[PDB]
Design a binder for these strands. Sequence first.
RNA 1: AGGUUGACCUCGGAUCAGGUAGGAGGACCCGCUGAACUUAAGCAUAUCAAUAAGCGGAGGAAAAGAAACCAACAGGGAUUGCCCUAGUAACGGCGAGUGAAGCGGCAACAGCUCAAAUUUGAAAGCUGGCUUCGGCCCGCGUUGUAAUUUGGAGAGGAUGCUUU
Lengths: 202, 122, 52, 52
Amino acid sequence: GALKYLEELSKKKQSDVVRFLLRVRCWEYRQLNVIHRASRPSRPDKARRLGYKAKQGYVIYRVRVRRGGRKRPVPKGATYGKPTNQGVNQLKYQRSLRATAEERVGRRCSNLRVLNSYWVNQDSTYKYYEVILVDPNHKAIRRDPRINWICNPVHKHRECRGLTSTGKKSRGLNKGHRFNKTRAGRRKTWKRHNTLSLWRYR
Amino acid sequence: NGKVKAGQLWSKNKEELTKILGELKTELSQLRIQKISSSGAKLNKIHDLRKSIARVLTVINAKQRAQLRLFYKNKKYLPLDLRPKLTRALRRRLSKEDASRVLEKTKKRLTHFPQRKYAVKA
Amino acid sequence: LSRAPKYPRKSIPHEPRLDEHKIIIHPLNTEGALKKIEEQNTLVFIVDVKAN
Amino acid sequence: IWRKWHVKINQGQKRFATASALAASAVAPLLMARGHQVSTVPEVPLVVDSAA
RNA sequence: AGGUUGACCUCGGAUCAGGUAGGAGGACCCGCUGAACUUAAGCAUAUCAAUAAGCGGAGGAAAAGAAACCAACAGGGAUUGCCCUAGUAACGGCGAGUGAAGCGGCAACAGCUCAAAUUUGAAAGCUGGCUUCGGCCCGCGUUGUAAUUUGGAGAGGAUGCUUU
């Protein structure tokens, strides 16, 4: 197959051919809309390994998001409480720009379910992602057992609840001692550790 | 008079049902003026004609909907009022066949190694 | 193209919501109506609020 | 509701008290002092045939 | 006819054919955002608190989940929860304070699907329309839909029995 060659070529992002393609594609995507439908994945190997199939009901949407940190919406950019010794310019959003992109694409297409998303390009101002979406109401989707789990109502807006890949990465859902506080849910673990259990025959 | 039984209405067809509806509406319109002109036992009668009009309309609507269901018995798309109501989530739920579809590898595994019936001696 | 639906959305067309039995309720029995009958050739009725 | 409602008791003390109550149930003065009408009872403790 | 006739690609229109989303509820759940009163003699670390308020998204449970795990043993073996570990290891102005996890016992247990392969002796796959219900069409798709394989393996052989 050709996708092995595409994977090994996509690993080399500083080669002349890949840099040229990224430059011209960044120009095209910057003169397109912020959120717009892609007719086909521009990285077919990445889309295929993330779950895209050339079947009716699979949609690709391209999106650009402004990169960098976040700012608190306070008047005049200043807080009127205790001194925090830091400015609002250096506050970091706890989710990824990829997750923000998936949320905006889902709000644009509220009738689809977000499956996954992948990085395609970036510049100084924006980061560019392509988001795979699946139509739960399409008969080709509903008849296929490999994908019809997404038609169930428990998978409504996975990108809004952190059930996509970037959501799992931001929630820290990994096994081991490095993820003691977050592997089963951070707030659930906190409530479990802070509950006071009193038994009858204590 | 004016209290039309539903058992009589269930045998009529459309045109004489509309005729009965018209005559009940006419007599009701007359007896409202009789009510505002004098007091008598006609109030029981206007109540009876109101319920009779309700019965006639119910019978006509039921026969119309039964005929429409017979017409749409074998068609793919039905009108939204003739489609089953259930709930919104139940209508959006997957069908039983799509929920019971399995992959062919799973079909082979369940064909050649299902759950057996076994017992263990003590 | 104009719409050519494969199924009607409403199976039964609804009846006239404002028909004449609902339009005319009852006449007026007050002395104003009774004076207008003889002096004006005018009949006074109480009608539906939605009727023109 | 997180008041302490139940009492945890040693099982040995429970068994001790049950044995003491069984021993006290075989004392005919204690039955009368506790209020039972056992004046017509033929014998204490009263054992009836299991065939009945 | 070639200044013509078409094929793709991309982007549009339509009250086109069929669908879907919004709001409510929000006790419990998954996230984001995020205080101060209070406690530290007062007080910018700290504490309250990764809480209240605010915002987004589900279900009858949600979430997590079949190891890029724990361990260092004669090794355990997806996830969740209870008891214990344990007020312990550890962190902490001028200290008020904070604080897990492995093992162990128990409740309950259940395992799997893709991408990376050429079906190449035959896209074998699928949405929709019309049906006389046999099928026939318009298409999607080779920039890859079926079968096969998922590391516990598997692909190729060899071999002789079992299975539906």
